[PDB]
Structure 1
Amino acid sequence: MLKREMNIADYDAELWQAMEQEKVRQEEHIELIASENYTSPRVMQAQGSQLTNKFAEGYPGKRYYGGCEYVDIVEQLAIDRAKELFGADYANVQPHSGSQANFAVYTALLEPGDTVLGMNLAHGGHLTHGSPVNFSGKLYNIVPYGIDATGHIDYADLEKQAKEHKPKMIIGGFSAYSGVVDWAKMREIADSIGAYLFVDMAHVAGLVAAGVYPNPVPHAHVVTTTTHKTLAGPRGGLILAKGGSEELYKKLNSAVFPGGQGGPLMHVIAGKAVALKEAMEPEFKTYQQQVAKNAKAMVEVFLERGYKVVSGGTDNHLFLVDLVDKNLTGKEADAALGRANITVNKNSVPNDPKSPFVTSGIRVGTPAITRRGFKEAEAKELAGWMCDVLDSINDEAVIERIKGKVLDICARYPVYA
């Protein structure tokens, strides 16, 4: 039946039409939506490989069915590289998503109905970290802890509510506009209660990978991350652990399979193995340093133009722009910048007068533009254009003026050259 050509575009016309229109969009839009990144052509071509036909159920070396003698090596490379890169003695590259990566931890260490002191969803919290609409909040009792006025973690507030409710696990996952997390302090608090320390570094994986952001793995029980964000990866999940007992490692192993999922996607795992090797390169370090370098350069521009930035400056690669004083909503800023081909997302400010859906502020990330080839001089130029739109918010002529400059710089700096 299979003649080994069937080009995606001689059979299905309308699907290819929509496929290439998205390709044009990505080549003509500035992506400043937080922690979104472009992946390697090595990953793409490994993801679209013949390994999608292979059904391997279980773990390498101890599979159920025969003929898994070669795919065990493919997965082991992804495991061994994950261990060496983040300095862990445990790695799991089978979870389909970051939501599934977290799901395993809850089913392994927690009973249905246990008190979990997770980060507040209303103030930058993740869905899998405790949400009424998510499985995490429905099955488990969630008691939220809040951050301080600037955005940094109140360590005295975390020590409280710990004796009041006595949680079995505390979630110290990274959220928006928050600075560095003292994970050494997290362990001291968790040990006094007798609770598990769970840290989700999904958002800041690439920065820890190069050595720009502190590593939570050395002093945490279970650490989860996405392989497709600040690490430039296939879309998936990862479970890492350091300094634990083998009886606790097999808890997480059983939590993935046969916990919540069946056979892992080997074509994605092949893309995971190559992506980790690219992160080990010295060229990945210079890129990741330039990500934080561009983030700082942008904050300088917004402050000089009279726009308030949360926490004064940026710690990593994310910064939130306050628009309360300018009397503008984040929904109106999103649509205005969206028309000028600048992709930003609306975000709620601390002490927001307006609806959490109207947001009165915007969130800007820098990993997508740095991957393209934007330097400090290009990052300040783009930040200058954004302020031009925010000044004349309803002037249509100004929006078209910026878009033309955006279309030019996208033509000068392509994603895939």
Structure 2
Amino acid sequence: MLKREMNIADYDAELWQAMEQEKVRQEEHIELIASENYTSPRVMQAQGSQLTNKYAEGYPGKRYYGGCEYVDIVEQLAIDRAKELFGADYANVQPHSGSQANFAVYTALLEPGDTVLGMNLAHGGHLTHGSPVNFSGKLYNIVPYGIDATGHIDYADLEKQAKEHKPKMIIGGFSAYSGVVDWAKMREIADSIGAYLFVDMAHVAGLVAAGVYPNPVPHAHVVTTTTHKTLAGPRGGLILAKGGSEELYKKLNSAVFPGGQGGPLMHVIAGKAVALKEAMEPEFKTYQQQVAKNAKAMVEVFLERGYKVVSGGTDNHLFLVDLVDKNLTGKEADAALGRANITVNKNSVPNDPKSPFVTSGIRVGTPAITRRGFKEAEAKELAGWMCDVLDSINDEAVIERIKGKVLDICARYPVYA
């Protein structure tokens, strides 16, 4: 018998103290990391449940272990809600993460060595979209594509590359692009050469769910997404598809298991189920709208203050600030802002003269501050403080003043009340 009262506090002081400090840090810091958010206590409740004790390999109704009658219901709920929210007729909720979800797609549709057309990392693409240090770049033949001098995808050049290299798959999606991708146009290009159009909408899933950003589901053969970014759910992956054959769906299911994973995390999947339900609320829709609005408000300030915003603006939740002309590395800016309790992340920019760990820019996202209560007024004021720090990056007095101002606005907008 394990007493339900056993806790970390009176048993592991070291670990507990670290956890409590992170809890406070989430309240005292303005999080502007585009890929982060604040999941609801409902999601955390699911993740802390006893579903963690169950091994449930296989799929609902067709498992490899006995006693899965109830976890089957849990997984089916996640599957059904994922389909209804995005308008898909197929969904796999078992991927442990976005990376695992993508790995499943690659291995289900391609053979090692096949040619793939994906967005280059510095230009906004994700590691799993072709980076040579990731499994994607190591196992497949990657042909990259980037953005214009205007900061947008040139579908004309994309078509040229597609026709010239004849890739077996074309990847649409990004980790740091602020524009709207024309999914239908990419599908056309893919069809012209008989390639698969794979769209990774991890970053914009929440926006797509609210109708604030074009849904790729009806244009791509396969779609993947994480459940922890703009979707504001638990950390995990998800695979979606529409209008595919039963064979295609069977391959996708097999690629996830027993192809690339073992037992799924049922407690996390329960979290996905409730998060997908919350994403159906009307308030979730107005939330995503504020997210997009706040991102625009912040861009205005940055431009007025004389900073280079890649693509000149944003149509989603994020934007990149190119610091090359300011003679600053993303690493420096990140550290300086951090001292003012403003947390962002250094980020490569198109044609970045520095390596990924250093970079010449920072990425800014509004999902967290918006979920926290911020609106345009607060977002604009915040962008101003950021520029004040960047202007006098070496003035300790400036950083101190800003820090006090953020600790202040943070106290008025608690994350978890």
TM-score norm. by structure 2 comes to 0.97
Structure 1: distance between partners of 2:11 and 2:356: 45
**Whole-angstrom distance in 2 between the partners of 1:303 and 1:147:** 20
Give the Å deviation of 1:56.
1.4
Looking at structure 2, the residues matched to 297 and 83 of structure 1 have their Cα atoms a distance apart, in angstroms, of 33
Offset of residue 175 of structure 1:
3.8
Structure 1 runs (4+) greater than 6 angstroms displaced: none
Conserved? CA contact 1:130–1:137, under 8 Å: yes
Query: What RMSD in Å do the two structures reach over aligned CA positions?
Result: 1.4
**Offset at residue 9 of structure 1 (A):** 0.9
CA displacement at 1:254 relative to structure 2: 0.8
Q: Is the 8 A contact 1:153 1:178 kept in 2?
A: no
* 8 A contact 1:130–1:136 mirrored in 2: yes
Residue 165 of structure 1, CA deviation: 2.1
Q: Which residue number in structure 1 is paired with residue 243 of structure 2?
A: 243
**Superimposed CA distance per residue, residues 205-255 of structure 1 (whole angstroms, 9 cap, x where no aligned partner):** 100010000000011100000011110011100000001111111010111
* Alignment match, 2:376: 376
- Describe the shift of the 1:352–1:130 C-alpha distance in structure 2 as closer, same or farther (beyond 3 A): closer
Residue 355 of structure 1: how far off its partner (Å)? 5.0
Find the aligned partners of 1:352 and 1:63 in 2 and give their Cα distance: 48
Which one is further off, 304-313 or 322-331? 322-331
SS of aligned partner of 1:239 = strand
How far did residue 278 of structure 1 move? Answer: 0.2
Offset of 1:156 from its aligned partner? Answer: 1.4
Contact between 1:149 and 1:350, CA under 8 Å: does it hold in 2?
no
CA distance in 1, matches of 2:329, 2:117: 32
Q: CA deviation at 1:145?
A: 1.6
SS in 2 for 1:384: helix
Contact 1:35 1:230 in 2 (8 A): yes
Where do 5+ consecutive residues of structure 2 fail to align?
A: none
Query: Is the CA contact (8 Å cut-off) linking 1:86 and 1:217 kept in structure 2?
Result: yes
- Once the 2 structures are TM-superposed, how far is the Cα of residue 310 of structure 1 from its aligned partner? 2.0
**Contact 2:178-2:317 at 8 Å conserved across structures:** no
1:352-387 deviations in Å (ceiling 9; x for gaps): 455554423221110010111111111111111111
Q: Is the CA contact (8 Å cut-off) linking 1:180 and 1:315 kept in structure 2?
A: yes
Aligned residue for 1:123, secondary structure, equals coil
| 1:121 CA displacement | 2.6
> How far apart, CA to CA, are the structure 2 residues paired with 1:316 and 1:151?
14
- Identical-residue share of aligned pairs (%): 100
Given the superposition, is the C-alpha separation of residues 136 and 400 from structure 1 closer, same or farther in structure 2, using an over 3 Å criterion? same
C-alpha distance in 1, partners of 2:37/2:355?
29
Q: Is the 8 A contact 2:122 2:352 kept in 1?
A: no
- Checking the alignment, whether the CA contact within 8 Å between 2:47 and 2:271 is kept in structure 1 is yes
Residue aligned with 1:303, SS: helix
Is residue 151–residue 312 contact of structure 2 (8 Å, CA) maintained in 1?
A: no
Count of matched residue positions in the alignment of Structure 1 and Structure 2: 417
* Rounded Cα–Cα distance in structure 2 between residues aligned with 1:132 and 1:302: 33
Partner of 2:333: 333
Could you tell me how far apart the structure 2 residues matched to 1:328 and 1:277 are?
43
Instruction: Out of 209-218 and 173-182, give the one that drifted further.
Output: 173-182
Q: Is the 8 A contact 2:95 2:238 kept in 1?
A: yes
TM-score normalised by the chain length of structure 1: 0.97
The alpha carbon displacement at 1:411 in A equals: 1.2
Any idea what SS the aligned residue of 1:198 has?
strand
Equivalent position of 2:86 in the other structure? 86
Between 1:171-180 and 1:46-55, the stretch displaced more is 171-180
Task: Classify 1:195/1:239 alpha carbon distance in 2 versus 1 (closer, same or farther; 3 Å).
Answer: same
Q: Which secondary structure does the structure 2 equivalent of 1:319 belong to? A: strand
Going from structure 1 to structure 2, the CA distance change for 1:139 and 1:27 (only over 3 Å counts) comes to same
Distance 2:60 2:34 in 1: 35
